[PDB]
Amino acid sequence: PEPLLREALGAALRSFRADKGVTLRELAEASRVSPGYLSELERGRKEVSSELLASVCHALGASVADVLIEAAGSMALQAAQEDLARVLEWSHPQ
Amino acid sequence: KAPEPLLREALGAALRSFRADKGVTLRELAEASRVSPGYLSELERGRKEVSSELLASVCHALGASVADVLIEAAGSMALQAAQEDLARVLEWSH
Helix pair B66-92, B52-61: axis angle to 10 deg: 100
Q: Cα–Cα distance between A20 and A36 in angstroms, integer? A: 20
Buried b (16+ CB within 10 A) or exposed e, A74-93: bbbebbeeeeeeeeeeeeee
Nearest to B55 by CA among B42, B70, B71, B38: B70
CA pair distance B56, B24, nearest whole angstrom: 17
| Residues B12 and B58 sit within 8 Å (Cβ to Cβ) | no
Separation between Cα atoms, residue B74 and residue B7, nearest integer Å: 8
DSSP secondary structure letters along B27-82: HHHHHHHTS-HHHHHHHHTT-----HHHHHHHHHHTT--HHHHHHHHHHHHHHHHH
B47 half-sphere exposure, CB direction, 13 A CA radius: 6
Q: What CA–CA distance (Å, rounded) separates B39 from B19?
A: 15
Alpha-carbon gap, residue A7 to B82, rounded angstroms: 28
Would you tell me how many other CB atoms lie within 10 Å of the CB of residue B35? Answer: 18
CA geometry: angle A53, B47, B20, nearest 5 deg: 105
Give the domain CATH number at A45: 1.10.260.40
CB contact under 8 A, B4 and A64: yes
User: Would you call B49 exposed, middle or buried from its count of C-beta atoms within 10 A (0-12, 13-18, 19+)?
Assistant: middle
| Contact predicate A74/A11, CB 8 Å | yes
Residues whose CB is less than 8 angstroms from the CB of residue A33 and which lie 6 or more positions away in sequence, other chains included: A52
Alpha carbons A20 and B81: distance in angstroms, whole number: 23
Resolution (A): 2.0
Is there a contact between A37 and A53 (Cβ–Cβ < 8 Å)? no
Cα–Cα distance, B63 to B15 (Å, whole number): 11
Distance separating alpha carbons of residues A65 and A40, to the nearest angstrom = 22
Residue to substitute from A50, A53, A63, A77, interface B, most B β-carbons within 10 A: A50
Q: Which residues of A touch B75 (CB under 8 A)?
A: 65
The DSSP symbol for B23 reads T
Number of domains in chain A: 1
Helix (H) or strand (E) holding B1: none
Integer Cα distance of A89 and A74 in angstroms: 22
* Contact assignment for A75 to B66 by CB distance below 8 Å: yes
CB–CB contact A63 B9 (8 Å): no
DSSP label of A38: H
User: B63 CB near a chain A CB, below 8 Å?
Assistant: no
Q: Containing domain of residue B38, as a range?
A: 1-94
Q: Do B51 and A50 touch (CB under 8 A)?
A: no
